Amino acid sequence: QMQKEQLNLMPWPQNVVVNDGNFTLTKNFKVNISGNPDSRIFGGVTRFLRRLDGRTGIFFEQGFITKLNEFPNAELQINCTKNGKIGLYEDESYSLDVKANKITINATSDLGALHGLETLLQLLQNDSKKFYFPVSQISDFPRFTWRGLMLDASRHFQPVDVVKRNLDALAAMKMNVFHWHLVDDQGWRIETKKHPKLIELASDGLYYTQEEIRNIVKYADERGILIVPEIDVPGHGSAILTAYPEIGSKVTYRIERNAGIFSPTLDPSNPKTYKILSELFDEVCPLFPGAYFHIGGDENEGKDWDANPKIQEFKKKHNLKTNHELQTYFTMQLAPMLKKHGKQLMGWEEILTKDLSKEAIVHSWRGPNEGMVAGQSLVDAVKKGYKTVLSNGFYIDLMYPVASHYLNDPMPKGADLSAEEKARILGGEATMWTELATPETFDSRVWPRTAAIAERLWSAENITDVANMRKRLESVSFRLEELGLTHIKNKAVILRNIANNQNIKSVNEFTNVCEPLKGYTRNKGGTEYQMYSPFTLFADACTPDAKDSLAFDEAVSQYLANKSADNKAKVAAFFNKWIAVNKGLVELSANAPLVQPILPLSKKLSDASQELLLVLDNKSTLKTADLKTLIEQCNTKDHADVELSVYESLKKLIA
């Protein structure tokens, strides 16, 4: 009897139907595995069972699942026809049939089966006493084969625990690529015995060991996820060149502590540049069994190359007119090195000029922030014959609203793309750059917006209803906590800190109408926060799509469409709430200096709120211009590196 609309599935599967009846979860529940899956199925099914029991408190009979055919008559049957392989273009499909007395997952391989377990967890329903799954059939497959997250380990190092729990969350959202950005101006993160200066002098002692790398590779593979390592060259060179100044381009270098674009760049005319990289690949490539190796290539601004007559001579010698042509030549010297290791080369879009091999994968990243049209570099690459991954429009570090990411589609509008051109669009990847995210705040930035991205990368192109997505995301986000994700819980840590461990109610309520400044406006010029600055302040507790701002927006829209007393009260209750919040924050501040920065903002919201209560009763006597100004105070960006995201709805009310 329940409506499909009540299911909180994400990604929304390709095919879904619900019918009368339920499967009831009891202490009899057991799982069986049949066919010929890869052994990764066993840990996956064990974890599934642990997670289901964590949610239900049943105390299932089974402990570790390790063999096929453990329980031929079990209530959950999982059938895999063959062994899955880690990589692109694998058959990731499955079907999930819930009947009144038995649940069946069928998949081409363990890959699909692991996906089906995630759908089955999302299907769990309950009443006041019991848990159940609705009788139903789901059949499913991904829209795109490359569905990724990039983790920047350079800006702020992200320890093994962060990486492991994020691999779990990727799996939970049916994401299958983890792109590991392991070097940038702010540090080198790969243990290297052949080139120990990179650890000694370019890491601060923060890095992944080779063994930890191998073990993370295995942890990902167990969970169906490919790792794509990145050594970004020849731009972003500050840390490499701290170790090896002799291959720099400037006619000296240090680990960079600020954010931004820097000048240190490897010298493509120096044979030593190529020898050192070749030796790096010999040591690093065997750690990563995936077929793809990302060599970066973003943001070389070219100034040291332009000034260096030796480089200018090299350009002339090779008939290379532009720095990008020189950088493609450089990249093409790396290609056979990677080929010797069995790897295909991938790079940020700047690598694409005429002589780039069509075997290279182009990582499309530039858009309006860079003066370009969103997606255009992708259109251009696939029309020229390159397989491409889209990250533009998925820059989750910039703290944009979830809808901006959810609606960003790897397949361009227009383009009159051929089918062959369409098939070169591998997928998409959210990019978590870490200038402004510590291990503590990382998850709060990645999740839950990356779950909405996961839906765009897996689900049908026409799954685009933002309100519906939001409704489903709430439970998705919640259930990620069982994997150790910190997005909700670490916020309370920060709030306790700011409030000197007084009652955090008011400061928590105030976060729910505040959002960190977006784009490149929090860390202005890159010099306001260093890579060792404290991220334990109010902006670090705030996220986009602030819960009470979204609720207030909805209340205000409903009200303005039908100005009923019930709808008006729903609005007015926010205002009374915010007046109380402000008083609570002033009280807290008497023993908490870290509340000081937000007091001007809560005062402005409280002042507006007070007047808007009179507006709603047509009892306000401020002059139009003074009412406009009062509300305008709430659009200030000057306090605590956050903004009030109720401002637009305050403006809609004042007429």
Add this chain to the structure above:
Amino acid sequence: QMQKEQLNLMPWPQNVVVNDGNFTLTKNFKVNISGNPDSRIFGGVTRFLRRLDGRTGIFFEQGFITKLNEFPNAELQINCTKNGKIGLYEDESYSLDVKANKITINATSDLGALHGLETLLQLLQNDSKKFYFPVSQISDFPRFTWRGLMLDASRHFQPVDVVKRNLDALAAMKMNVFHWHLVDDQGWRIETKKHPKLIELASDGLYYTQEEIRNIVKYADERGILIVPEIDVPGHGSAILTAYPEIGSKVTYRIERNAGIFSPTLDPSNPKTYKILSELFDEVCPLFPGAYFHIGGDENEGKDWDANPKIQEFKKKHNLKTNHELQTYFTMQLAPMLKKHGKQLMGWEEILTKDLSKEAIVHSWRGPNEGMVAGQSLVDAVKKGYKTVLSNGFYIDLMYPVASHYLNDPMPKGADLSAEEKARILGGEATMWTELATPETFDSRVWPRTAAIAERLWSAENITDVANMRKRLESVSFRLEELGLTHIKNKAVILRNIANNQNIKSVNEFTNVCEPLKGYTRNKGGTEYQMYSPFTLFADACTPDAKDSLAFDEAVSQYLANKSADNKAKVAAFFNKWIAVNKGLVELSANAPLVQPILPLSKKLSDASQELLLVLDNKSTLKTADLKTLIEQCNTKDHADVELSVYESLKKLIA
């Protein structure tokens, strides 16, 4: 202007004087290090600065601290005379002097300076706008040299991240020993490349690699902490004997899934037992540079030994009359293996019979729960000539109230110990056995109670005021969150699971009158929870010393002593609160099956509250016997494996 009574220092230092004025923290703040410390001082000073900045939001100038005399006029000067060594009997003393314009830490070595940095953090004060340190002089040192936490990694495996943050917490509390219980019936946790069957067959894939162990030893050493590894033999042998059944004693074995005392025991008559153990020490001892190696020895109940005719002949051959004599013989066969690696032998008190070398350290653990007198095995061991560590009365896993641990003293009363005998009491150790703690709930069990234990092990013997200790503990527990400790934050995760992500307010308030069942009554017989059961339920969100219970108790005591209007109203406020909590839980339960187990308990409290409100106003007409039954309902242990810790005070109100 502070008074010493307002300072939240823990352990309370040996000498504390507060004088007039404050040092004000500003953006000019810097640190300088002088003298001849061990290099561990550099990371410790860097983490200090990072932590201080996180609390204050100042954005200090210095990033990483890496050399001596970086800023010779810095506001904070740290002078160390010599290099500290990891081990026992080090001089861990320091002085900390805060003047209006300058702060100095002077210490014999970096070990004392590391401690002083923790005291300095605890001295941080603020008003509404600024942070400061009171002008004061502290000179300090520990009462005992062995101030330890034991972590059981066998019952529930505790990943690297758990171990690392707990090492930070130990340093924060000036604790200097981490005892790692790396094997038990429920799993073997040491990567062994030469005895791979222990990983393959006895670990479920859950273990620390050798490189992880070496890097945890380093992490600990950097923080002034000794690691003491334990391979527990010959009892608790289930997992060892799953890999090597041929050295068992029964005339077949599996990794144990339940809690309890089990029969599988190594065979001390079999030459292969000593061969395998000698090989294991050859592989494992090099991983742990500390001078002490724990061989366990607890709870061999001796049944397989008694039954085995070969072991009986062996006892006749060696004139060993008792199992304990035979086990001491076995233990003394290991003593030269350990000494060959430069290690001294430690074991649980069972190892002590007459022929145990007086160079063995005796770990005193038995008391009234084992039918013994608390502390007596320690008294006996030091009188006989053996150095001893007290763990009896520091069994934090059993969920006893903090005061039982805080008042437990490694120095026995009325034993007329000699000075030589006193000096054999090395110190004490909190033991976190993990039958009933996952990596998620581990910190909620350890902290903050182990912080009170830290004070017992460091501070003077006469610092015993429980109420003052509780007052100081609140901020100590809060500040541990900056080190990643999950004791507070993971509780909300559990409450969201229980509430189905509804508003957790009522369930959180109900945790504040409930405590998990104590002793050996939560997992009755060891068979109610397995090592893979779900620890995501109400008992897992509750802790001893529930805050509203303690407040209630105080309000009831004050009222019965002085039945003033105001006092009566303080008592009544709890009853009105509990009525509201029960309503909230009933509301939640409509969509949250995991609330069902607590409803009977919250209804029992609400019912008592309703009647006692009438009692307090003499509007009650219930008969004495019926009022008594009504309150007695609240002493039930049958719901959710918790108890209402307001019951005793309810009973006092109606006596």
